[PDB]
């Protein structure tokens, strides 16, 4: 049995076929650039304290001290959830008496906001927060949102892995992507917060899904010269392209449900890919269902004006693969046997230490010194010299070295935050910036480690667990905000501690590097063990 890619050779690299197929399967991830980060200004949080109706007619005065006031950040601001004692300030301004000259501020009493809060418009005009006011002794349930949503990520990386490894490539990608749509768009019509908190689940469940079933059929159908511009100039630029577009819908629309309409509309197109993406044919071989794979390749064939030749398949390969058309394979595979399950641990160790690192600091831009909108923009432009570098270092390196280069850049970088002096915030900024390009080469790369190290038969499985263990660390970021009271350093010393102890980790998987992409449990290298 010839490896696939010498049966389908006579096609070529790049013609009408693949080049549909390359941009098709890429203008697929621009949905996802969209909805991965767009949490962000979803679940802002504006500046708010307690309202004060203008039932009670208050003297001037009094209205302007009916609120603590309080050192955020050395800031001298109102209390976000405390007031005056509401009936006492009016006694006072009948009475005739006014703060400071009669009354000391000291000794009122105080108490929560009974009348709810009045969130500031100069940012975001209405948010879940605001909805629901997700804030003071309910401020956990935002950060709570976004961990559900990362929850529903992993729960989307296990189960989509299998269900495509089982029952094809194209049927999976089509449903979770039909999936991410529609619970989008129900999300709009939210009238609760548990009902938005479950359809954000499913949201991810859907988005992760997708993205990985998309970046496995592209990988499959293209030739080895493209595969590695499929990954990285492919679908990884265009969910860059989806994330710098997200501040901009941000900039222009300030309502939440308009925001999210927006966001979701475009992922609407994606439906006429299904009269053009075919089933992966390498899929289909592994499985047995020479035909499906034989009717694709012809058309392949006929689309590029190419002259088919008079058998795709040798008798003896046909043959040859009658016994494989009988056996299954399932999640247990990938730990049935010593080399796979080695592989699969340092696999998983990878991807939560690159993934923990990458969603930190992309989750991280709202605290950053400046605008939001721009800070946002720069964390999703500094991505594409990323995907550029991790193109050049797959073409041109061994994974190995450049995997280690990438990560220890990242690490070494986020490492030294703790010197930059304190009013060189811009120093800061682009040092976060350089992190950020590193870890984010890395998690392009780390992506195509994956998919060749795992044979065709679990493939899709592969990476799914791979990306499963790795919404760990994703989980907890939004909690990393909490660490920094601590110090404001110590998440930065964290992520580049994790990355340069991984960095050293990548020297003992196997060199993949111009090897051809396994279809068999097998086939696949041996790790430098038993
Ligand atoms: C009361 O607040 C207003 C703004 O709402 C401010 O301009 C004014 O100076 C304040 N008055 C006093 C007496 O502090
Ligand atoms: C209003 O304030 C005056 C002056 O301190 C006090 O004597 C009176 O009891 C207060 N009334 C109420 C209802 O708190
Ligand atoms: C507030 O308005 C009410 C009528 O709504 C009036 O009786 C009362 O005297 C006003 N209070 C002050 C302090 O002027
Ligand atoms: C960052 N990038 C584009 C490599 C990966 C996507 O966010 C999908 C994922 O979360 O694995
Ligand atoms: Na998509």
Known sequence: ????????????????????????????????????????????????????????????????????????????????????????????????????????????????????????????????????????????????????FFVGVLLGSFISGQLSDR??????????????????????????????????????????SNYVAAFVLGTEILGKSVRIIFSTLGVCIFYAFGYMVLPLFAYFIRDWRMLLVALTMPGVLCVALWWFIPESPRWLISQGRFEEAEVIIRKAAKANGIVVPSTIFDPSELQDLSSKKQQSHNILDLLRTWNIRMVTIMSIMLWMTISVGYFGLSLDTPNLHGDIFVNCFLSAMVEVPAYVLAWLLLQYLPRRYSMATALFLGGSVLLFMQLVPPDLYYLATVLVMVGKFG????????????????????????????????????????????????????????????????????????????????????????????
């Open 1 to 148: 049995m010839r490896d696939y890619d010498e049966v389908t050779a006579f096609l070529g690299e790049w013609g009408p076929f693949q080049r549909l197929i390359f941009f098709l399967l890429s203008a697929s991830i621009i949905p996802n650039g969209f909805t991965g980060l767009s949490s962000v200004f979803l679940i802002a949080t504006p500046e708010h304290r307690c309202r004060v109706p203008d039932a009670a007619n208050l003297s001037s005065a009094w209205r302007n001290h009916t609120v603590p006031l309080r050192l955020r950040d050395g800031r001298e601001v109102p209390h976000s959830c405390r007031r005056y004692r509401l009936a006492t300030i009016a006694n006072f301004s009948a009475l005739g008496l006014e703060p400071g000259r009669d009354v000391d501020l000291g000794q009122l009493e105080q108490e929560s906001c009974l009348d709810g809060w009045e969130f500031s418009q100069d940012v975001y005009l209405s948010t879940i927060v605001t909805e629901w006011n997700l804030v003071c002794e309910d401020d956990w349930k935002a950060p709570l949102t976004i961990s559900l």
């Open 167 to 208: 029952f094809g490539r194209k049927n999976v990608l089509f449903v979770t992507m039909g999936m991410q749509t529609g619970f989008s768009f129900l999300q709009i019509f939210s009238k609760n917060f548990e009902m938005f908190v479950v359809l954000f689940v499913l949201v991810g469940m859907g988005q992760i």
């Open 439 to 530: 870890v984010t080469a890395a998690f392009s790369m780390v992506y195509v480690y994956t998919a060749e190290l795992y044979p065709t038969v679990v493939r899709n499985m592969g990476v799914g667990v791979s990306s499963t263990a790795s919404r760990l660390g994703s989980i907890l970021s939004p909690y990393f905000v909490y660490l920094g009271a601590y110090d404001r350093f110590l998440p930065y010393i964290l992520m580049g501690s994790l990355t340069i102890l991984t960095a050293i980790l990548t020297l003992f998987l196997p060199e993949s590097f111009g090897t051809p992409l396994p279809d068999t449990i097998d086939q696949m290298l041996r790790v430098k063990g038993m």
